[PDB]
Structure 1
C-alpha cells in the first residue's frame, strides 16, 4: 500500500508527481498539445474573417440544419466552423466580415446537436449579434 514512513517525503512526493500525469485535466494544462491545437492560442475570443456560410446537419436524434460560418482567424491563419446562434441570425453575417468568435461553453468539447463545433459567433462587424437580433443597433452601410 502506502509508503507512509517518516523519511519518505521524497518517495511520496515523486510518486504523486508521476501519477498526476494520468489525471487527464492536469496533462491537458501542462503539456503544450492543447495550446498548440487551440485555434484561439490560449484566448477567450478571436476575430476572424468569414469565408463561407455553411450548414451543419444536426446529430442523429435531432434533425435540423444548423447554419454555421466558416471563419479564418486573424492571429493564427487557422480555420473554424463557428455556430451563428439565434433565429435568422445567419442573414446578418455577410461574407468577408470581421466576426468575433468565442468558445461554446465547453472548453474544446463540442455541444449538443452540432458535430465539430467548438465556437460561436459573438459580434459581426464590430456590432454584437445579440444587438442585431433584438433590433437595437443596425449593420452599417
Structure 2
C-alpha cells in the first residue's frame, strides 16, 4: 500500500529507516555530537570547579554561584539548593557540581540555571546541612 512490501526490498526499508530516524529530537541530541561538544560537562557525571562570585508568579530569589570548570575554562552558574548553604560557600572555594533531574534543560522556576552544588572543600552538602560533619578546616 503506502509502504514497500515486496520480497526483495530490504535495502529500501533499511535506507528509509536510517534517513527518517534522525527526525527525533532525543535521537538527534544523543547521537548527533553537537550537544556533547556544547555541554560544558562533556558527558561527565559531575565536575570539579572553582567558584568566583555569589549571586541569587513566585517572587522568591534563588541563591546560586558563578563557577569556572578547571578542565574546560568556560563559565556557568550552579544553584545551591539547601537552606542556609549560602554561608557555607565562600568565594574562591573548590566545589563539585552536578546536574538537575532534567539533563540539559532548566528545572523549576529558576531562569538560566542547570546545575547543583553537592560538595565544598570535599564535604557533602547534605552531610553538613544536617550537622553530621563540619567545615572547620576552611
TM-score by length of 2: 0.95
Residue aligned with 2:23, SS: coil
Q: How does 1:1-141 map to 2 (within 5 A)?
A: 1-55=2-56, 61-139=57-135, 140-141=137-138
Counterpart CA distance in 2 for 1:101 and 1:4 is 52
TM, length-normalised to structure 1: 0.93
| Displacement after TM superposition at 1:6 (Å) | 1.2
Unaligned runs of 5+ in 2: none
Q: Which runs of 5+ in 1 are unaligned?
A: 56-60
Determine helix, strand or coil for the equivalent of 1:89: coil
How far is 1:8 from its partner?
A: 0.8
C-alpha separation in 2, matches of 1:4 and 1:125: 64
What SS does the corresponding residue of 1:21 show, helix, strand or coil? helix
The 4+ residue runs of structure 1 with deviation greater than 6 A are none
CA distance in 2, matches of 1:6, 1:25: 33
Q: Calculate the aligned-residue CA RMSD, in Å.
A: 0.8
Aligned residues: 136
Give, in angstroms, the shift of residue 132 of structure 1.
1.1
Partners of 1:97 and 1:32 in 2: CA distance: 33
